[PDB]
Write a protein that binds this ligand. Structure first.
Ligand code: FES
Lengths: 382, 124, 360, 240, 120
């Protein structure tokens, strides 16, 4: 009767060792100041580097036995039990359970504790982009998750940024329109300009903005096949953006290389079928870039294949000053002397060249200015 | 029923033998030269025409069951004039992609169901 | 699991004991997903469900470990008086539906890989029949035809016929035949098994194997059958080496083929290249022509893109009559997608329909 | 387990305890099919079968786990009076048929794959023999002959004859010959082993391997055997 | 198991307990061939053989599993007078004949593919 009524007034909760919440709560309770714990157990993490160097860290956690803590002015009874029969084969360790006990007159006051535990996990969401590559018939990470780069970092011509952003937002927001029409829900944007215009950087920045991973594919790759191409662009990972680069590989030669059997085989038929027919339509945004738009084919700028095209030429003086103050925040009027200096110079310069000459020494702005006369031929020496 | 194989242990160009259900299985990590050569063949010569992408999903890794398809005997890799597999029973030749190119064998080596697990590969 | 999830959501209950279940999926980009759910866990609980008191007792064994789940075995014991309706059925069915609230009916598309089929991409969302526009009679004609075929099943079985159907959709390209097939398959709740004979290295033996080992509850769609017939006379001197055999196709169509209510849809753009020998009962039973866009089609699709804008469609149909040109379905679609909510502009750029193939 | 399923069906019990058995199939299209059965589960139940009282005692192993299904071992213990007919045979029989009734069986078509015989599509439904028609004196003329051969095994075996028989149906135009063969095989409950001598890349040794080593209780059918005669070495005089 | 099979057919037996042994073969064509056999199962039994009563016991060993068979380790035992002839040899010989009757001595023909013979 006494035990029955006791359990009737008090909530008792259990946490199996399998749940991540087990370790999370152990870590949290190790940190809690208002604690009365006379039992401990060490946990040591080891990583032996390739060269023999080893990193060591240890921590004391409450371990088996009862404890006593007060959370938000409410007493709680922890009770860690070590299984004496079971071995958690997945973890290669005996089963464990940390159980809590509390009067139920107040709320369980417990989602709060596990939200505090969540706060430890929330710190790990800093990584915010990954690059995917065609390792084969499918997509796999090309490397470590890259760090996202902020969009204003990349500085294209005025309006182009805003137009692209507005258009992609417009496409994405009105998915229900595509669903209602029954039209496939996919859109294409073509970026064409001289090399080194920061096109790929721009696409990467945008992918960072919308959190989608990037899926890279180079059509100059010599071992692509239209069937595998069609497979990849439809087996794409979720929350991804497909970036196609040197699409002119299909324009300039088409099936001539395929008949010759020399290098890549992809051609227009692969483009058409993989763009519309039998393609994934749940959701997709595709980006194409081409360094040689002059070889464009009039059959492609049609809805369903592509709909947006925009030239990206040499950086304007607006871009020049914006990026100059990007490299040299503040530094007013040095930008003025620089911009008119390059206007007197009066030649075509790619944004990559400007970046290079602003970064080659981590220069002071006047230092970059002093040698700015050599931009007529700076591609040779610097 | 299911056999799990570590792919990383296999160096480039080295064949393997694995028993799935007791049937032999060949694992070969192909080199780009092999990819180019196999893809460069003419289907007309093949008694059983088929393309590398349709033989196997991954050009890196090549899978099949080691049976002659003429009789139950097993061929041997890194043998024959075509540099692929050879059968020492009745002299059936198999190219790098396990496609019958000369001999009494009627069909290319059949492929079982398999799944890629990054470091490892699950065959079944 | 279903019942535990269900009872966790039951308002009328008392549960002194609880336990946590955490959902933890680490996203590839670095983000992470976390979610808690305090299930009742071991102990005893009481629940009153539409008038009936039920005692719920959960216990885990102290000696078993489940190899699959990697966790000790557990059981949930309900109990109540006999005189009830055996309401356990009611409770447990309720637990069933709440778990399966997703209602994830899709339309898979398979594809040939060697002699076997393979799922292609994620299961696409269903696309209903009216989404695609066809000429009057053709659509509903095909619908009633296939419905009669499937319904009239025992007829075929008893009277010694292998119960196979074949529908041919021939006409100029750019008519959305494949889209219509997809819509029909989604409507009928059937997967699609695409198999393009064009530009695909098919050996008649392999073709027969694929068509006859198709997954159940799946419609077989052969695309561009005329390629085979073309290569009967072309590849013999050209060398396309992706030709298959017409005789093999006939054997792969009729010889010893499947009979599990198999339905096959074939399409082509060059009926003249076809011969009147493959056309027989049991292989191509009901054929229809699908020409260029007709007045009916343009009106219906304009209403699909601009519902309620009937007067705008009237101006549009006047304009296209003034143009008086022959256009396929696909080209005319481009007008309205690039003018998503601007039909007046599509009305303005009616003259550009001559050059629709280039920019529009 | 057929006993459990049968006991669920049998009325006139006292089944105080129950257990759920769930079948959950995940279709590739996303939908899932679920069915829900309440079986007696542990505890003790009672039956009144044909005036005989049978006690049923389900038991769940307190230590074991069966690897075959990854579940604790269980036992079903019937009990009754010796004076009965030992109706256990009867109840087991009338429970067995329930499992049998679910799947009657059909006819399977095998086909060549290299040297091996393997199935070709799902089991085709049985084609009833009357469903195919031929000239009078023909269908019965084959049926009686094959029946005679089926029963004359002693007439062959005790006298050392090869217990084989071969038939030829040489209808020029082609009128339901294959249909008749398949109907006859289904009637005799024999799987069909198909082979077309017109198949390219078919060798004598591989043929001889395939015509033997057949799957058990199978009828071999060689289509258009004239290819062997006509397609002489002239077509492949180079050694093809 | 031959011993149990033999005992099932022995008529001079008293067996209050029984167990079901099922031989099930599923044919590829969907047809199923099934049989049942009421072996003595656990518990004591009595059998008269050549005028001698031989007690019998069968026992399912808990805390054991035969991994190959995948069942609890069973054990059978017999008991009778040492003074009179222990007829266990005779009993086993009788049971053995129940197995030996099955095989008529088939002839097997091998054939050479590769450098090894195999069944044909
Ligand atoms: S069995 Fe290998 S070559 Fe014939």
């Amino acid at each position: 009767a006494s035990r029955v009524l006791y359990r009737q007034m008090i909530v008792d909760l259990e946490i199996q060792s399998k749940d991540k919440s087990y370790a999370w709560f152990l870590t949290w309770m190790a940190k809690h100041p208002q604690r009365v714990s006379r039992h401990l157990s060490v946990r040591t993490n080891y990583i032996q580097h390739d060269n023999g160097s080893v990193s060591t860290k240890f921590s004391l956690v409450p371990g088996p036995g009862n404890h006593w803590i007060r959370y938000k002015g409410a007493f709680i009874l922890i009770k860690r039990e070590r299984s004496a029969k079971m071995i958690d084969i997945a973890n290669g360790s005996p089963f464990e359970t940390v159980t809590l006990t509390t009067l139920y007159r107040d709320k369980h006051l417990f989602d709060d504790i596990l939200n505090e535990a969540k706060d430890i996990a929330l710190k790990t969401t800093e990584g915010k982009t990954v690059i995917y590559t065609s390792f084969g018939p499918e997509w796999r990470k090309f490397g470590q998750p890259k760090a996202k780069r902020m969009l204003p970092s990349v500085i294209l011509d005025s309006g182009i940024k805003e137009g692209i952003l507005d258009d992609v937002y417009d496409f994405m927001k009105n998915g229900k329109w595509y669903s209602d029409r029954g039209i496939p829900y996919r859109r294409g944007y073509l970026l064409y300009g001289p090399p080194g215009s920061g096109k790929t950087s721009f696409i990467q920045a945008l992918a960072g903005e919308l959190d989608y991973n990037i899926c890279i594919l180079n059509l100059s790759e010599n071992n692509l096949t239209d069937d595998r191409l069609n497979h990849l662009m439809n087996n794409m990972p979720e929350r991804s953006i497909l970036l196609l680069e040197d699409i002119d590989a299909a324009f300039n030669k088409r099936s001539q290389t395929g008949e010759q059997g020399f290098h890549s085989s992809v051609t227009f038929s692969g483009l058409l079928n993989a763009l519309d027919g039998v393609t994934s339509s749940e959701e997709t945004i595709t980006f194409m870039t081409t360094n040689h738009p002059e070889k464009l084919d009039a059959a492609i700028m049609r809805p369903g294949r592509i709909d947006y095209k925009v030239f990206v030429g040499n950086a304007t003086p607006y871009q020049v000053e914006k990026m100059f103050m990007k490299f040299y925040p503040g530094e007013t009027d040095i930008c003025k002397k620089f911009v008119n200096s390059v206007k007197e110079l009066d030649i075509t310069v790619s944004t990559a060249q400007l970046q290079g000459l602003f970064v080659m020494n981590k220069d002071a702005p006047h230092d970059a200015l002093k040698m700015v006369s050599s931009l007529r031929n700076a591609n040779h020496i610097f | 029923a299911k056999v799990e194989v570590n792919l990383a242990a296999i160096p480039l160009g080295k064949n393997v033998v694995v028993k799935w259900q007791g049937k032999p299985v060949f694992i070969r990590h192909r080199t780009p030269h092999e990819i180019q050569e196999a893809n460069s063949v003419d289907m007309s010569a093949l008694k059983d025409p088929q393309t590398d992408a349709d033989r196997v999903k991954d050009p890196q890794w090549l899978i099949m069951l080691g049976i002659c398809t003429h009789l139950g005997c097993v061929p041997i890799g890194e043998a024959g004039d075509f540099g692929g597999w050879f059968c020492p029973c009745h002299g059936s030749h198999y190219d790098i992609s396990g496609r019958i190119r000369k001999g009494p064998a009627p069909l290319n080596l059949e492929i079982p169901a398999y799944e890629f697990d990054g470091d490892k590969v699950i065959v079944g």
